Structure to design on (485 residues):
């Protein structure tokens, strides 16, 4: 809070942080993608898709 | 130059040029394209009985050499001999196409012949990948149409064929109206026309062969993927130009631009082909050759290739097709000039060979469609006429943003989808 309760300090640091996290999420996404990229997506059959690929 | 053609009761055509031997043979205007899915490989089956051991000895004693050829548009049975024995030939041709049209087809010879082509064709489908892929290129490019039938015939329709089928075909196709007897080598024109007119008769004259449905092209692909093969062979083409076409040569010149290449032969890598810059940096393939297959109904313009660089096939195709794009927008003048010189060159070595059995097959096929052979000198006149502007118009119709036929075998996992390759047939514009 940065005070006795939710007041000015709270709302101003909260905006500050609301701006910051999105950029972290974005970073977190690129990792999600890197982790995706080494094995590729799965498929509905739940079996290997190595025999029939399409760009 | 020469090339003379006269009728009678049948049509005869000859081309004499005092050399070594002289060959005479009957060339029929029907072939693989005139067969059916179920009787396919009947012509390739005639070719082997005519070349049977039984008949081969009969002409060998007499001092002759037998040569048969089976194509899509035609069929040919040729007998080679010395300049003087020009009569020894006709007496054999006629003996096997009239007297022995009851013999040969006798069992023990047919069964022997059939067991031999059944193996011969099984060897081809297991080993000759480049030609097999090309055969399948026709198979898919012209599927469900005359031209789609493989010359050697299928391995199945072959083992179902019996003497009856052979006879039925002969009776329906080997006819007076659908035939041309030719003579090349050193034998004169007047010598043949008369030796033929000696023994009269006709043998099924006035009889015409069963017609069909005009061959057509279809954007399609056939992928015979075999991971156990050490290379990846692929052929790819578009709808070409048929013989007796305004652009017969313009199309043939375009292929000569990109030509052929063998990555292992030093001289080949030095050619004046822009594509060879793009393909040599990472050695995209072992070899490749561009063609312009023409026939009576249609044709195929594209290229064939083999590659060991299985992980970069997409670039082989990419660069190769980006070059084809140039023929519509940026083909330079010297590219066209170089093509002419090299077209003329390879065209000449084709016609001007020291083997009449080649010359025969070339004379027959032509006169069997246009009814006359175009003199080599006349060709050069047309070739030199062709302008940059000409190549672009042709490419605009034939090549630019047009469907394609693809066929492949071996490690072709790296050959991208039809739509990916199809897309490269053009370029972005404002």
């Amino acid at each position: 809070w940065g005070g006795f309760s939710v007041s000015n300090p709270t709302i101003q640091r909260f905006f500050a942080l609301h701006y910051l996290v999105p950029f972290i999420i974005a970073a977190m996404v690129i990792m999600h993608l890197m982790a995706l990229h080494i094995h590729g997506s799965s498929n509905p059959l739940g079996i290997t898709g190595n025999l029939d690929r399409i760009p | 130059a020469e090339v003379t053609q006269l009728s009678n009761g049948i049509v005869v055509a000859t081309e004499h040029n005092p050399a070594h031997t002289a060959s005479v043979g009957v060339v029929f205007g029907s072939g693989a394209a005139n067969e059916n899915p179920y009787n396919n490989g009947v012509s390739n089956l005639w070719k082997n009985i005519f070349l049977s051991k039984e008949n081969s000895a009969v002409a060998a004693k007499e001092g002759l050499a037998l040569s048969s050829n089976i194509s899509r548009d035609f069929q040919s049975y040729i007998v080679s001999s010395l300049p003087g024995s020009t009569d020894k030939s006709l007496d054999f041709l006629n003996q096997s196409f009239i007297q022995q049209k009851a013999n040969l087809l006798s069992s023990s010879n047919f069964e022997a012949t059939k067991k031999s082509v059944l193996k011969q064709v099984q060897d081809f489908e297991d080993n000759d990948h480049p030609n097999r892929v090309l055969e399948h290129l026709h198979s898919t490019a012209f599927q469900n149409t005359p031209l789609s039938l493989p010359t050697r015939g299928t391995l199945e329709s072959l083992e179902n064929l019996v003497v009856a089928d052979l006879e039925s075909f002969a009776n329906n196709h080997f006819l007076n109206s659908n035939a041309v007897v030719v003579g090349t080598g050193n034998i004169k024109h007047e010598d043949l026309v008369n030796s033929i007119e000696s023994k009269n008769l006709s043998l099924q004259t006035g009889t015409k062969p069963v017609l069909k449905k005009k061959a057509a092209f279809l954007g399609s692909e056939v992928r015979l993927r075999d991971d156990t093969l050490p290379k990846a062979w692929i052929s790819l083409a578009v709808e070409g130009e048929p013989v007796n076409s305004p652009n017969y040569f313009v199309a043939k010149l375009a292929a000569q631009i990109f030509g052929s290449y063998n990555a292992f032969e030093p001289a080949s890598r030095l050619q004046g082909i822009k594509l060879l810059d793009n393909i040599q940096e990472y050695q995209l393939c072992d070899n490749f050759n561009h063609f312009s297959l023409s026939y009576k109904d249609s044709g195929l313009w594209g290229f064939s290739t083999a590659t060991r660089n299985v992980t970069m096939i997409d670039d082989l195709i990419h660069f190769t097709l980006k070059q084809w794009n140039r023929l519509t927008i940026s083909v330079t003048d010297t590219e066209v000039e170089r093509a002419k010189s090299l077209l003329k060159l390879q065209l000449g070595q084709l016609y001007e060979s020291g083997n009449p059995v080649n010359d025969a097959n070339l004379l027959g096929a032509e006169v069997l469609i246009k009814g006359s052979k175009l003199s080599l000198g006349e060709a050069f006149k047309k070739i030199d006429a062709i302008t940059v502007k000409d190549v672009k118009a042709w490419a605009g119709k034939r090549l630019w943003d047009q469907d394609i036929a693809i066929a492949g075998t071996g490690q072709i996992e790296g050959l991208l989808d039809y739509m990916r390759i199809r897309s490269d047939m053009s370029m972005m514009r404002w």
